Amino acid sequence: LPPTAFTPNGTYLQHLARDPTSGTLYLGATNFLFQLSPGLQLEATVSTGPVLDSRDCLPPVMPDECPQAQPTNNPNQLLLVSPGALVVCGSVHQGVCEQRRLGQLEQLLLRPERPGDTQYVAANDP
Amino acid sequence: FAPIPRITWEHREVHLVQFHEPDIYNYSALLLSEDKDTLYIGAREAVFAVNALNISEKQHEVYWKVSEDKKAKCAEKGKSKQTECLNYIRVLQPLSATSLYVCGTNAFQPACDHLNLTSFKFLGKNEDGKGRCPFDPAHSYTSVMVDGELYSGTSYNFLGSEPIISRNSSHSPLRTEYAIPWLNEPSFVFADVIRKGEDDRVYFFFTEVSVEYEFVFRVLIPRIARVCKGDQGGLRTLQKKWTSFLKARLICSRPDSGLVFNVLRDVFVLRSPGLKVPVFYALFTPQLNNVGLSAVCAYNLSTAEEVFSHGKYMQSTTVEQSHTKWVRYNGPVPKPRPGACIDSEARAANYTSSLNLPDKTLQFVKDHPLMDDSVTPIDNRPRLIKKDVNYTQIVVDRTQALDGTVYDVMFVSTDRGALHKAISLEHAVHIIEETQLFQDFEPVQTLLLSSKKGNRFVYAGSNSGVVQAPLAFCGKHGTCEDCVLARDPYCAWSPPTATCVALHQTESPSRGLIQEMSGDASVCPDYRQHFFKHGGTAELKCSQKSNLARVFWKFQNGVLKAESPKYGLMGRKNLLIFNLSEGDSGVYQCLSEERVKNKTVFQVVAKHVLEVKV
Ligand SMILES: *[C@@H]1O[C@H](CO)[C@@H](O[C@@H]2O[C@H](CO)[C@@H](O[C@@H]3O[C@H](CO)[C@@H](O)[C@H](O)[C@@H]3O)[C@H](O)[C@H]2NC(C)=O)[C@H](O)[C@H]1NC(C)=O
Numbered sequence: 192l193p194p195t196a197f198t199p200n201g202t203y204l205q206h207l208a209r210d211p212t213s214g215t216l217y218l219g220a221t222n223f224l225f226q227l228s229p230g231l232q233l234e235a236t237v238s239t240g241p242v243l244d245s246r247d248c249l250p251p252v253m254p255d256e257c258p259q260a261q262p263t264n265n266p267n268q269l270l271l272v273s274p275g276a277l278v279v280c281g282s283v284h285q286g287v288c289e290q291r292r293l294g295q296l297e298q299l300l301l302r303p304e305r306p307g308d309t310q311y312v313a314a315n316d317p
Numbered sequence: 318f319a320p321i322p323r324i325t326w327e328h329r330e331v332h333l334v335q336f337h338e339p340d341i342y343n344y345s346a347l348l349l350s351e352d353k354d355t356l357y358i359g360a361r362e363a364v365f366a367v368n369a370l371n372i373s374e375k376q377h378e379v380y381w382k383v384s385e386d387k388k389a390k391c392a393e394k395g396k397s398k399q400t401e402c403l404n405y406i407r408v409l410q411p412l413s414a415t416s417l418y419v420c421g422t423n424a425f426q427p428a429c430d431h432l433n434l435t436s437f438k439f440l441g442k443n444e445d446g447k448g449r450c451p452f453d454p455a456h457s458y459t460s461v462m463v464d465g466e467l468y469s470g471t472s473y474n475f476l477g478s479e480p481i482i483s484r485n486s487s488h489s490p491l492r493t494e495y496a497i498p499w500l501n502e503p504s505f506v507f508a509d510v511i512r513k514g515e516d517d518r519v520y521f522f523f524t525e526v527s528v529e530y531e532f533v534f535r536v537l538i539p540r541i542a543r544v545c546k547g548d549q550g551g552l553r554t555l556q557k558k559w560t561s562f563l564k565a566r567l568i569c570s571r572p573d574s575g576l577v578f579n580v581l582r583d584v585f586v587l588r589s590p591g592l593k594v595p596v597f598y599a600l601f602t603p604q605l606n607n608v609g610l611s612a613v614c615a616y617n618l619s620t621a622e623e624v625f626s627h628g629k630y631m632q633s634t635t636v637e638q639s640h641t642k643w644v645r646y647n648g649p650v651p652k653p654r655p656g657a658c659i660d661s662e663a664r665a666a667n668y669t670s671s672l673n674l675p676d677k678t679l680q681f682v683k684d685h686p687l688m689d690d691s692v693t694p695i696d697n698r699p700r701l702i703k704k705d706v707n708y709t710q711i712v713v714d715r716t717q718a719l720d721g722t723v724y725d726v727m728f729v730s731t732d733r734g735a736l737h738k739a740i741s742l743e744h745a746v747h748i749i750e751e752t753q754l755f756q757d758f759e760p761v762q763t764l765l766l767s768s769k770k771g772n773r774f775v776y777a778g779s780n781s782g783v784v785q786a787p788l789a790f791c792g793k794h795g796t797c798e799d800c801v802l803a804r805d806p807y808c809a810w811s812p813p814t815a816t817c818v819a820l821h822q823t824e825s826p827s828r829g830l831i832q833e834m835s836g837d838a839s840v841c842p843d844y845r846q847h848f849f850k851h852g853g854t855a856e857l858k859c860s861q862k863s864n865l866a867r868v869f870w871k872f873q874n875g876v877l878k879a880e881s882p883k884y885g886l887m888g889r890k891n892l893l894i895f896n897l898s899e900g901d902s903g904v905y906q907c908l909s910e911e912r913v914k915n916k917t918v919f920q921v922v923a924k925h926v927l928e929v930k931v
Pocket residue numbers: 593594596617618619620695
């Protein structure tokens with residue numbers, strides 16, 4: 192009955208985080224986020240890229256201010272479960288982070304609209 | 318090298334007004350009023366208001382002493398309870414017509430407050446001066462109040478591990494980055510606003526560990542830096558940070574002699590009544606082998622402005638592959654120019670503030686605060702290089718001579734409580750005089766000039782008190798020759814009054830006055846009797862003020878040789894006739910000889926009529 196394996200197509204995996212509470216697993220992949228049951232059943236999928244980006248440019252990546260912006264893939268840089276949210280940091284957009292609802296991966300809680308240098312969290316390079 | 322001070326004035330032989338409060342020390346902060354008649358002194362745990370015309374007249378007093386629970390808190394942090402754990406006034410700046418902005422170390426809790434001038438009582442604003450004032454009385458510090466906003470350079474913390482150049486604005490607070498490219502172990506020396514589309518700039522001067530140079534030990538380097546008054550920081554990057562911070566080497570050296578002075582001690586801004594461009598007079602000492610040497614380099618603002626406006630920046634690069642080396646950047650520079658102010662050009666490209674500058678430009682300045690070009694002195698050499706003297710602070714007065722030839726008068730203080738007056742004569746330094754300001758040889762920590770009509774004074778602070786000196790002592794000169802030979806642009810000889818007067822002060826007629834900076838006392842118009850017993854000994858006293866002149870004696874119209882047994886010289890100037898007899902009677906003349914240019918100037922110092930009894 193439950194999957195014994197999880198092999199996502201058209202992507203590579205970076206990170207895994209287990210929710211001590213519910214047993215829920217979250218997966219950080221290239222341009223994808225997955226929510227699995229403790230039995231590996233796929234529950235939710237979120238797209239994370241590609242995005243128009245350049246390591247030389249600051250988010251929000253504006254084409255008029257960043258003409259060298261080119262489509263970039265988004266390997267997951269950081270994926271950690273906090274009491275309130277799922278903490279998500281990518282390789283893209285200066286290593287900016289976001290907060291998603293635990294159990295409702297699709298539901299975004301916090302993703303700063305216009306972030307500054309003090310909010311560039313993770314390594315902007317896989 | 319500069320010669321020795323022509324004349325030495327003992328604290329005893331000149332009129333110097335002194336001020337100190339019993340049990341109050343470290344008179345390091347000096348500020349004079351708008352009216353120039355009231356000088357405010359910032360000391361350790363106290364602030365005073367003294368009559369600037371007679372510093373000894375104490376007008377007002379206010380204390381800001383540290384509590385025992387605060388002293389013990391400081392001591393428990395392994396500091397000295399009776400030394401460092403006290404309130405050293407570090408910030409003494411004008412705030413308004415009715416108030417001053419005051420900050421003290423305060424047993425390592427930098428605290429700021431407003432001194433109410435009408436009451437001479439503190440308002441108890443009790444502001445946290447962290448960033449504005451140093452914690453340690455040992456730490457470097459600089460501050461300039463610009464448009465009621467404090468621009469300060471000091472340490473951001475207790476240990477002095479975090480440096481900071483910042484603006485306590487309230488509207489738009491801005492500070493430097495805590496990074497080696499920005500500041501690398503600086504020791505703050507001086508700051509001021511250089512006022513004007515074009516924005517004002519706030520210049521900073523300091524010594525820091527060099528990134529461009531590598532030697533046996535870490536090499537220090539003097540720095541000239543500036544920020545734009547209108548800075549508001551970057552929007553996405555440089556959030557609450559300087560976007561206009563650019564720095565450059567300040568070079569003071571004579572290379573044909575291997576002399577390099579890489580430690581900046583003081584900076585004075587010569588604000589010319591005539592010249593449209595200000596000149597920075599900077600005082601330096603060498604880091605290596607200082608024994609000690611001092612140099613005074615004068616820098617034209619335009620030169621520095623040229624480096625900051627058009628100079629190529631320096632790039633940092635990785636080198637094999639754990640090292641960093643700094644080289645000239647010859648790559649593409651963004652537009653608007655990184656580090657530039659919001660000028661006429663920027664406003665045309667719809668840029669109103671730093672907050673709307675492209676991230677390209679902001680990132681560039683953040684990664685390139687250092688310029689490749691050095692800021693060099695006027696005539697590419699120091700104005701003065703001196704040996705056997707450790708100079709501490711500097712002031713300059715631009716004065717017009719009788720002739721109309723303008724001289725920039727350098728008042729330089731020493732680490733032994735002395736003041737030297739020097740002028741760069743025709744391609745050579747002339748140290749007019751030296752005065753012992755402090756009877757206790759206390760180093761002059763701070764120096765402040767008032768060249769204003771009437772109240773023409775220099776004010777020097779040390780740990781023991783404050784001294785008030787005039788800019789000249791013209792009256793000390795006895796003869797016309799002595800007055801001219803001084804070669805002081807301030808002093809002229811008055812034939813009607815038979816006194817050496819202070820030109821641009823006295824009410825004597827200009828057209829009928831004598832002054833020659835050449836030292837040719839030729840422009841000038843032109844007997845102590847003794848009766849000693851036979852066999853006895855005579856001491857004929859003779860003295861003069863020139864440290865650059867030597868005295869010889871004459872008897873019976875011939876140059877007498879002060880040799881045993883008949884003659885002797887006591888103190889190299891006083892003649893000693895040993896065995897008095899009939900023939901020793903007559904006129905004895907003490908004469909001086911001093912070289913000015915090529916020529917020698919002989920003067921009759923003493924005239925004596927010695928008569929030996931029978
Ligand atoms: C400080 O640096 C500034 C930057 O150049 C110096 O100013 C300029 O000096 C040049 C040199 O002569 C001036 O050019 C010309 O002067 C002659 C003399 O009469 C005149 O006949 C020419 O028609 C021309 O004006 C230039 O105008 C002048 N500009 C300014 C704004 O001063 C300044 O002299 C330097 N000061 C010191 C003490 O080094």
